[PDB]
Amino acid sequence: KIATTVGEARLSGINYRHPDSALVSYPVAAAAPLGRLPAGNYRIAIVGGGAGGIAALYELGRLAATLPAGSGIDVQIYEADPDSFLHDRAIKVRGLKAGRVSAALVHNGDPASGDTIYEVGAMRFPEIAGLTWHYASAAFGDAAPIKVFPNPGKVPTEFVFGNRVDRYVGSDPKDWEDPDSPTLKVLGVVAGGLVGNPQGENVAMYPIANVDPAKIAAILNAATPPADALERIQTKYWPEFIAQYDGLTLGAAVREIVTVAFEKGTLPPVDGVLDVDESISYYVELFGRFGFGTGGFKPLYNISLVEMMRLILWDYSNEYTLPVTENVEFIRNLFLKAQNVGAGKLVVQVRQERVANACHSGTASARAQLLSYDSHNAVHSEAYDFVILAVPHDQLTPIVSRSGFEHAASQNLGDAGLGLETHTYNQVYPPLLLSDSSPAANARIVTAIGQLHMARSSKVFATVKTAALDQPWVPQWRGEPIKAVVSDSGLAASYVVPSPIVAPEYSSLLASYTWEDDSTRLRHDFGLYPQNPATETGTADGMYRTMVNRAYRYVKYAGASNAQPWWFYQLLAEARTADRFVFDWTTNKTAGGFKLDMTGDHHQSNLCFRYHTHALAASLDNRFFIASDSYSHLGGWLEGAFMSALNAVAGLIVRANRGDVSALSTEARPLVIGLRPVVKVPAA
Amino acid sequence: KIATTVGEARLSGINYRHPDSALVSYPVAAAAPLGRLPAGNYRIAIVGGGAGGIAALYELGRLAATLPAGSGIDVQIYEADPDSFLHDRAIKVRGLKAGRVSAALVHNGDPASGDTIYEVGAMRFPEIAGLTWHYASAAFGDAAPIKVFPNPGKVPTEFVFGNRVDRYVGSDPKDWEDPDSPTLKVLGVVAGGLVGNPQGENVAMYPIANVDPAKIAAILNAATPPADALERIQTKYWPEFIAQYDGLTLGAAVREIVTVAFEKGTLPPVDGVLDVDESISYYVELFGRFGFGTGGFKPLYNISLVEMMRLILWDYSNEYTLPVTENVEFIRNLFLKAQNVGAGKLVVQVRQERVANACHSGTASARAQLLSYDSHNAVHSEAYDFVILAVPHDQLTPIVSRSGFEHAASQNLGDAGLGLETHTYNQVYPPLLLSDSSPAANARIVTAIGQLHMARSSKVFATVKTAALDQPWVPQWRGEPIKAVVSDSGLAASYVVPSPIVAPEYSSLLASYTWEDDSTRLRHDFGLYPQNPATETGTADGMYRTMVNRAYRYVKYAGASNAQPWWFYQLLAEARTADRFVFDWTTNKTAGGFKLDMTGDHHQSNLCFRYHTHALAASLDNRFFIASDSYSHLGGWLEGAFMSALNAVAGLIVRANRGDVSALSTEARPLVIGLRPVVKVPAA
Ligand SMILES: Cc1cc2nc3c(=O)[nH]c(=O)nc-3n(C[C@H](O)[C@H](O)[C@H](O)COP(=O)(O)OP(=O)(O)OC[C@H]3O[C@@H](n4cnc5c(N)ncnc54)[C@H](O)[C@@H]3O)c2cc1C
Ligand SMILES: Cc1cc2nc3c(=O)[nH]c(=O)nc-3n(C[C@H](O)[C@H](O)[C@H](O)COP(=O)(O)OP(=O)(O)OC[C@H]3O[C@@H](n4cnc5c(N)ncnc54)[C@H](O)[C@@H]3O)c2cc1C
Ligand SMILES: Nc1ccccc1C(=O)O
Ligand SMILES: Nc1ccccc1C(=O)O
């Protein structure tokens, strides 16, 4: 049952279809090239060298290899991040970023002989992330070993909320220190109420298709689902769930579930003095700090229930590592494999330039324009046949939103407010061109993008000797030291991760991994933004000491009468002075970590997810596609960036074929035709 | 009719009762001293010299004057902010702050002859903010003149969302450039749906007591309601509204209202051509950017409907200025008045120290302990009879949450992780002491405080000649230039406010006032945190250029042949180079601007609002009270800070009288007994 290789994870998730794209398994769509292109010499730009852009490049490579003699694809990849791996062909980050897949290498002067790696962005990969594992197989092979990510509960864990402490491993109460824990009771109540049972009676509060979500998850993952089930999910049942529940937050749903359980007597008054509403509140907030398997989702309580349900269906918490020292190696290997698969028909050039503007203009074949600035702030203008905008939404906004929403005789585009040179474009149309006649339709996609929610996130790291865990002051549970701590201290979630450069001498002490308001509460103490230290030779000691100080709390345990300062204070203080670190995604140019949908946001994110269907309108001459986890129903996952890239390339194939969906492979067609189109075109 | 003096505003809202405290008009409670104290020589601490702490001092002065000969009150006021007015007897901030009432004086070398003031925090005051005006009258007199705050719609305004532009004043179509504007139509739909009609048919979607909120607002503002009506609101109908709608976001509510109106045919398909869900979505997001009279509430869409409904009942948008050059003068004048009214019986000393911990300890008469650090990090400990903790929630957390939840024989408290000196306290109980026997009751208050939502906010300012508004490219209405701009450019809300140091030569160009995700999106560009410039003589020129560059957008006006760069880009660029500024409340030690409740947050904030009722439990003997807008149902308003102060002093009086509510005035008594108690046992 535990996957031990890339191939075992890959095969576990190969069939899984997400509910907003329930007709199609993306890994099955990706098994062969996505389609065919007419003979030609295509000039394509990819803006962004992260997971989205690089997956898109790989699929373009697969398409290029199918082109006849004399034809080919030339791709210009724009990548503004000076630390990207694409520009590299104590704490080091240079060359160790692929967007939000971002490593920091801790070393003592020789980066080839390092101590540990801080995984600053992506770090844990669901088993049924089928497209992720599909690409991991392309990058590494099916035989490459993987490990269980050491989430809370997967290793011995301490949980602290208010007066409550729990030490546990797993969900078997035999392996909880207090089998009568209220935490365990609330967890069962919330699981019953949200997920329900895969067999038998339906007990969940928020059914899909009048059944528990556990039953729908099994259908979505089936090799051979019942006839019509996937269509009915896609067109009826999941839309009905959204109609009912997209206006309900995760926090509101947890409180409804808790309230019913408290009324029934399943959850008792917290002790003899708490009133009704206070007891209900305590349980809601207790569950909030505990979570679903990856730490407290209290900070994520404003997400739509729809968004949580996507993660429930996916079994999101059951996560693995990649077969790497640094996760960036996955994206770097995919980039190299893209060039190999192109078979010499794909040529790639990297531009260390920031794109400022996209538009359609002029009367040439190559009408998709990109205006960029290089590292000397010099302007460049380049025209393309097709462009894939592979950047998340706040980075995309300035590129797409400043050209208005209809034809313009001329525009002087660029970063004029910065004092940078502009370029005059003539006969201009917006880049995200949903209509030649309706400014509102053009506005809808732009405004949607600009109002997606980027979740805030920060990570505080230090380097500690792994042997620190063996000290008598670190608790042991079930034969191993505590290596995950979930708490209301302000740190939120903390992990003591063995170094992947190796039992290793060192561990990465992820002292605090925060989301949303948990991150906001810390931000004043970070000192430098987005990264402290901002240099390779510094250490964020002052910042880190503020985190240590949040851990300076008197904690009463059942095992001792006199409360002492929390042991975790001592462990955080055991970290070495050098190489203390924080990265704040919020103050990075991404304006946060990743998209999570609020109530009502489905309508915006889904528009983005379906945007590539514009290629069905042959009379619309739109050359731009979008490729990021921002434009998916899995913001915060490689799987979402990869899904979005698959969408983008499928749309581009249809556009290149002037609206002919038959140019997509049989298995890839549903990527376009299984969605509600964003343009109205005739049936069939 | 428009109010023209402090006294006119004061009388307007004198009776208004908020729905969570519907049995009391706070201005009426505050008219006479709140009660009486036994004879004695009291030693009190107030932590924080903002609006909460200073109003609490004022009320303690009033009490002090009533004490008999030989009795008195000594107050130690702790204020950590070096820029506080309390510590003061180009951009200058020193001496110009009272917490989140914060001015920046723009000058050329002589601060007595400045150019303009930037109101960095509080700036606009609802007419019906009765307690605010009550204190403004204490500070300035009833005769002092006030002005209508130049909100969007109160002065000529441009609104931009997607392809839609409107130019307007108020809500009469005759005063809109496009009287058939869809924007104005959606405002009527959403207002009808949320607020409804004060007379006639009930048209609102979310009734209170089965009627439109407008009807309830009239009852809550009556001199002589029903007695029965107030109690029924307090105990039945507002609680039922909470039960129903605390789990519904404002954004979800807006979409429900728009959906029904679109199905009825009150709103047309957008462009004649977007589909049903695209049309509804467009209208929801259009309304989101337009707002309720103070700019778009899109960034606030995650607040509960309960929270928005408090502001609807209060007519919050109808706002005025104070009779000052800088709003901090209000708080300074209240400080000075506190000392005058204490008639010699009040002694005040100011400490420039940061409180690190509070607790009860020991066996002496004075048990309420405060541990603090001065500006060079020396430790101080002092014991008091009573303590008012007048700091917002994130600042309160470290003070109250690190001592555990029950009796402890001894603790070494302080900022040990910062390397600062600790102090040993013996026989220690938590400061927010709700139980002698329940650690969960103690944990509930602490955990609630720590998880309140501090809304993010930032303000970008520059100095501009007022005459820039007379440039030919600045639009005008009846001779008056546009002075407010509400946009989806990233700037959110922009104002050109005439200097109060005076027609004035200069204006404060509030180039961007953002909340929540609107602020997050900008934050990467701020450069220095929380303030750029950090010095008096620097300028945030690079930051401000990024704001000019967000305004560099092609905007199409009706009738025009082509889009042209937005005129507002030109206006922003007219600001002088010197004195460009941002302040980010999020990276200040407050960890944001002010409390706004998410879905499910009622129970956390309401617990805090009712906390002072612990005074009813005589044997408990808890000496700590809390006083901030964080512990109110008006986070983001002085009114909330003042209400919480009034609560804190009322509770203090009851506690000083060993639980006897007859020590409060007849008018003040409901401050305590009109709320559900926080201690169920013992009764009181
Ligand atoms: C804190 C955090 C935790 C996460 N946890 C996980 C996890 O455990 N598992 C998982 O699967 N995923 C996780 N993710 C999500 C995963 O990192 C993202 O889904 C994925 O990396 C996003 O790829 P992308 O291509 O959409 O965007 P990005 O990674 O943001 O890449 C975009 C690229 O475009 C470039 N760029 C942007 N603007 C421009 C411009 N104007 N011109 C030129 N270049 C530009 C950028 O420099 C960047 O390299 C996490 C992310 C973060 C930040
Ligand atoms: C951007 C913004 C816009 C706003 N707009 C409006 C508006 O237009 N109208 C309106 O009525 N209100 C407005 N408000 C709200 C208003 O400013 C607040 O409600 C009010 O000022 C808060 O007072 P307070 O006493 O609760 O807290 P604060 O003002 O935060 O004061 C707390 C004080 O305690 C001190 N302190 C904190 N921690 C410690 C410690 N450990 N030891 C010692 N001292 C400490 C601080 O330095 C500070 O001086 C706005 C606020 C902001 C920030
Ligand atoms: N990567 C994520 C995205 C969304 C929510 C949680 C996670 C998590 O890793 O727990
Ligand atoms: N001061 C506020 C608090 C809450 C929401 C709006 C405002 C405003 O001034 O518009």
Curated annotation (Swiss-Prot), chains A, B:
Top-rank taxon: Bacteria
Effect on the protein upon substituting R124K: Reduces catalytic activity 400-fold
Post-translational modification: Proteolytically cleaved to yield the active enzyme. Cleavage of the linkage between the 2 subunits causes reshaping of the oxygen channel and the hydrophobic environment around the flavin ring. Removal of the prosequence causes opening of the amino acid channel.
Coiled-coil blocks: none
GO molecular function: nucleotide binding; phenylalanine 2-monooxygenase activity
Presence of keyword RNA-binding: no
Influence of pH: Optimum pH is 6-9 for the oxygenation reaction and 10.5 for the oxidation reaction.
Record note on what altering R124A does: Abolishes catalytic activity
SUPFAM superfamilies from the UniProt entry: FAD/NAD(P)-binding domain
EC number, UniProt record: 1.13.12.9
Binding of substrate, residues: R124, Y513, G636
Keywords: FAD, Flavoprotein, Monooxygenase, Nucleotide-binding, Oxidoreductase, Zymogen
Cofactor: FAD
InterPro entries, per database record: FAD/NAD-bd_sf (IPR036188)
Reaction(s) catalysed (UniProt annotation): L-phenylalanine + O2 = 2-phenylacetamide + CO2 + H2O
Subunit structure: Heterotetramer composed of 2 alpha and 2 beta subunits.
Protein's name in the database: Phenylalanine 2-monooxygenase precursor
Organism, as annotated: Pseudomonas sp
